[model samples]
Target: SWYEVTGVATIVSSEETARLHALEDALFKAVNFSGADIGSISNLMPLLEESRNEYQFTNHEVRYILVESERKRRGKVEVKIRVDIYPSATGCHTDQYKKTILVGNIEVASPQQAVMGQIYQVGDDFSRVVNRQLDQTSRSFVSVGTTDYSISSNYPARTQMIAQDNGAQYIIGGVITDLTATVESQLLQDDIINRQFALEMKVFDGKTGHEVFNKAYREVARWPFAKTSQVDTRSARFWASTYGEMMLRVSRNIMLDLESELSCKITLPEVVAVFGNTVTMDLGRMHGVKEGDKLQLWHTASFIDQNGLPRNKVSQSEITLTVSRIYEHEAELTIDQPNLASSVQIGDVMNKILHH
Candidate 1:
């Protein structure tokens, strides 16, 4: 019944004819199942070409394993094949992720103190003492040079130091809080003289401009003051010696504070860029660029104004460029499509597009 109305079909005239007819029928069925048009089919050709260009599978040992669970029950047949795609005899894909880093600043707070004396007297030396302590503390983070002072007609002599140092961000400033030096003479007894000196300093964060580290040191030492012929200079030496020792103690304390508060550690680079084309990169013994390597170009456009705020809009097209040379400080790029854009400027942030 199924073969009753065979339409224009007839029995095969010869073995060759029958084979040709069966082949035509098989091709027709295959086309129907594929459902691919000219455009879609054309798109696949490039992919196939790329695969052939990028890789090869010669002597690829693939074995098919057919397993039957139940032979008696007529179970379905299962086929499994394992494949290993190897690199072509000549070509290789390069790795393309570049590592980079950005650096910035950190700020800290510090306090200052002033003492009493002439420019060359106790006050001047005491200021130097405190500054020396601060200097030592700063070195724990960065090696800062010597401290300097200047004379200003407008400000006090102590304040002049800040101006002389060109208003360094690290230095601190303040007025003398207290000063005490005593001299006593008895009729027939040795002079009983006593002196006490104290200094306090505070370190702050330079970013938020807040004090984060603070420390103080006070030194009290007494020495016998014996009168000379007409001058009693023992008192001056006694105070000076006490102040010097106090400064040393303060220096130690500041160093400890610095070690506790600051860490000299920094982050490393994560993104790096290599300048060149795939061929040049490969020939130069460079093989980082891979299939996913993004290649990007740098371009600058001016800001357009809206009602109030500024708007940055890139036009339909941009100049295409590629990294040609690279170094630690700067990089040189080769312009691929220079005519596409009006101008290209240096110092622009070059981005990666092909191998991002």
Candidate 2:
């Protein structure tokens, strides 16, 4: 049998126990399924703590699902609650599923074009254009900032640690390698000038510090001067229609590259430590895995199909892993069940769980 829940707590009890009791009441009320009245259970505080212990509710196993708090007439406070009871006990058991991914700074390399004299200020124009298109065309990811970062000559060793602390899975850091700009001649006033530009960039994995993608995008186009006075300094203004198309062109495939690169991921690191099905991977919270996140674990084979026409299809089996403990770049994971046929190992591959 299953039961729904609701509870009431006092702020004076602090957020834990009081909320625990509230959850307890919810469990009790749910299990009992009563119809006495407001007077029946509203003031069961003392009764619940007595020798009878009617609810038989103990600690916090489920979540405080619904919470409502208010200040009373004189100086009293109250908190109402609901609980979500899952499988794990002796622990909060919250690694239920993966919800979101946050991205850190994406730096543009040297020889970059700036808006109002700020290079990184306007942010990655490449990302800006791609992100806008992504918002409408795809639901693969919802990122808060410009994209991935790995430990490289660009980012420090502690970079991954900081990314973990911020609750972001990836830190995207890339340098605008080149922005070759050429001014088509016209040394005197009333003379027209053409501008040609090019840009290059690369991405990396924040967890393993590996270069994921390295590519260059270039554009060579002619732009006639639009302004008559101070035409020499108005290059930034014409950038929108002129060089902007170059940025758009570069970012177009870069966006496609991002979709293709992070998509299905070439590889999702390996399990290095294990306790039953629960294990530790080389990366975790820092690489975007979070508490209450659920992931699918797979048993893979080098050969696709060993049955008929081997290598025709990818061979794999499924097991579930839920995220639990999180610290910097590493975290603890719990297996959905211990009955997995193939034993978990140090080189297993798991899929990254993303919500929408």
Candidate 3:
């Protein structure tokens, strides 16, 4: 929920210095309070500065009222204040940021690789295929999902290290079994190859360090092994020829399987401006946003844990809106429900509705 509070403070300074100090005094009381979320206070600081410039009416609300004043030393040096504070919202925030998924080296079932032009592992083919395919993306679905061969060496040490150090939110690792590749002699043909593997995968939540996604996926790909080489089927030459196509089919299947297990991520955007009921957001056609797309608005309030790690909580009151116009990096929104719109403000977060 959005949080706000009122504070009253008194400041004594020379007549010329009283006004600004009085305001400063109020800001401190709210921000420096015991167990205060320092990060929230930091974000709130700029709103006051922007308000003084008459910019957009300062969406973050804060106020200090003078209830009484007493003469001190007759040179004019006494100020008492009544202040209002908008404290950061509290509780566990959900989906406050995009998830980052890291793909690690896949372990092959076969101990010894088949003799080929170069050394090759059983599960290496699928891992390479998935990693390469997922490498090219807008990263709108997952902010930091990618493959890292450098992180492959130490396994879990560097895996968890990078996850925590680089702010990665999710990690994916897997093993491939039932690996087989061979030539099938049926009707007379140049070469027909059969290859298959059973993919078993696990996904862990970096924050909680728990297994959240698990599945055993299996598939088989058979092709003519179209490209022929002087070094034929026995030496793994024919398998290499059709490996590209075989892996392509398997990679596609994995993505399809992912849809069932993972939540569809709607690109989250920030509100840049809000005037009356209309809002300006940081998203557009370039971001794959459509005119009819809808969004729910909320703010993230953050706190630190015992380990001094920062955490966030999404606000409970959600304001709803719809896209009415599109731009390169921004979009305009119309309030769908005015009653909920009252609390909407600049810098409010957006979540996808009607997500696939």
Best by TM-score: 3
Model 3 gets an lDDT of 0.51
For candidate 1, write residues 178-207 as lDDT tens digits.
335465567745465454545455443322
lDDT (tens digit, per residue) of candidate 2 on 45-107: 453343221232334232223333322322233333332333231222122222123443344
Which stretches in model 1 have alpha-carbon errors above 4 Å? 1-123, 127-139, 143-169, 183-190, 223-243, 263-356
RMSD (Å) of each candidate, 1 decimal: 24.4, 17.5, 15.5
The TM-score values for the models, in the order shown, are 0.31, 0.40, 0.41
| Top candidate, metric lDDT | 3
Please list the C-alpha lDDT of all candidates, in the order they appear.
0.31, 0.46, 0.51
TM-score of 3: 0.41
Listed per model in order, the count of residue pairs whose N, CA or C atoms clash below 3 Å is 33, 16, 2
